[PDB]
Amino acid sequence: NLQNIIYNPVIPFVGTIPDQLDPGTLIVIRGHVPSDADRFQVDLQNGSSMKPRADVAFHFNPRFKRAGCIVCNTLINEKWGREEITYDTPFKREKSFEIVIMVLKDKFQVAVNGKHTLLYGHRIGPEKIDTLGIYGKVNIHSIGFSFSSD
Amino acid sequence: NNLQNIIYNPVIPFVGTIPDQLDPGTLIVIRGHVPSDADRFQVDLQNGSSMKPRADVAFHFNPRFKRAGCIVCNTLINEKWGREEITYDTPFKREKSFEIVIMVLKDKFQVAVNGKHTLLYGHRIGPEKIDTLGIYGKVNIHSIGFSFS
Ligand SMILES: Cn1c(CO[C@@H]2C=CO[C@H](CO)[C@@H]2O)nc2ccc(C(=O)O)cc21
Ligand SMILES: Cn1c(CO[C@@H]2C=CO[C@H](CO)[C@@H]2O)nc2ccc(C(=O)O)cc21
Ligand SMILES: [Cl-]
């Protein structure tokens, strides 16, 4: 059921999500972490405004310093909320990944390389998300959606 | 037969509390038969048993018998049905007995009937929200039991 919006996008990438992230929707991101990566992020946004900065419903932010982690958060009116940090991180410098974001009624559920990674409760209604951004030190092979509505 | 909370010949419609959480690896095992004039029946994995307003249905598993038959899978959220996922390759048949095995995985349900893979259904509601098993419609249920993880 997977409809790729794009292959091998230049980073930073910002794209319109062509249908609503209804419960059951999957977002599938395939890529590779360069050997000098500090961090990258996948942001599910309410628009693409840079000034002022678009709200980020879901900021999914792998960080590579020390033993590494994933920081998840929400940006509302240009302010970050309570960080949810996952120390059990599957990402590594110079390794390839497949991220699967499952949109559920009340949360995102993220798996990497087929292994459960984390959950993130909705702080912004996911119906307000219409943009996907990927930023930072990361190589993206593909971004695709499997929409509920299809 | 190591199954847990096994009950026999429940009255239909059935609405029962699921006696533990639907963690990855959990099985729900339902044995029954389709009466000869069945239009449809359903197995609903619900978030409670509210009738008004109607309880969310994480997984509606709805065999239908008209024409070549099918299984309709859907989710009810805030009394609105989502996009139907229809399986046209259906193992169910009027006057035939069945064993349904619903395996809960982290990202989907995997359903087998009489030991044959039938369908997959991706989660739309977190399965931790499911506490109720409803069985409704034109069906006889011989037994229900569980395998918890
Ligand atoms: C660093 N950075 C940010 C801000 O990220 C925040 C910094 C710290 O904590 C926040 C989460 O709590 C968030 O990661 N937003 C960004 C967007 C793009 C880029 C970039 O490299 O192109 C870099 C970016
Ligand atoms: C017919 N029906 C429903 C509604 O089913 C919906 C109707 C059409 O499409 C939906 C799936 O998209 C769903 O089967 N909920 C029910 C609950 C119980 C019964 C009953 O026969 O007891 C019958 C019921
Ligand atoms: Cl949920």
Residue numbers in the entry:
A (entry chain A): 7 to 156
B (entry chain B): 6 to 154
Question: How did the manuscript describe this experimental structure?
Answer:
Galectin-8N was first cocrystallized with lactose, and then the ligands were soaked into galectin-8N-lactose crystals, followed by collection of X-ray diffraction data at 1.52 and 2.1 Å resolution for the galectin-8N–6a complex and galectin-8N–9 complex, respectively. Both complexes showed that the O4 and O6 of the d-galactal portion bind to galectin-8N in a similar manner as the corresponding oxygens in the d-galactosides. Namely, the O4 of the d-galactal is involved in a hydrogen-bonding network with Arg45, Arg69, and His65. Further, the O6 of the d-galactal engages in hydrogen bonding interactions with Asn79 and Glu89, while the O3 engages in a hydrogen bonding interaction with Arg45. As for the galectin-8N–6a complex, the five-membered ring of the benzimidazole ring is placed in a favorable position to engage in cation−π stacking with Arg45 while the basic nitrogen of the benzimidazole engages in a dipole–dipole interaction with Gln 47 and Arg59. The carboxylate moiety of the benzimidazole establishes a water-mediated hydrogen bond with Gly142. The endocyclic double bond of the d-galactal moiety in both complexes is placed in proximity to the guanidinium side chains of Arg45 and Arg69. A NH LUMO of Arg45 overlapped with the HOMOs of O4 and the d-galactal double bond. Hence, a favorable interaction between one of the Arg45 protons and the d-galactal double bond likely contributes to improved affinity of galectin-8N for d-galactal derivatives. Compound 6a is the most selective galectin-8N ligand to date with 15-fold selectivity over galectin-3.
pmcGalectins are a family of proteins that bind β-d-galactopyranoside-containing glycoconjugates through their canonical carbohydrate recognition domains (CRDs). Galectin-8 is a divalent galectin found in the liver, the kidney, the cardiac muscle, the lung, and the brain. Galectin-8 is a carbohydrate-binding protein that plays a crucial role in tumor progression and metastasis, antibacterial autophagy, modulation of the immune system, and bone remodeling. However, there are major differences between the two CRDs, such as the presence of Arg45, Arg59, Tyr141, and Gln47 in the N-terminal CRD (galectin-8N) and the presence of Ser255, Asn257, and Asn348 in the C-terminal CRD (galectin-8C).
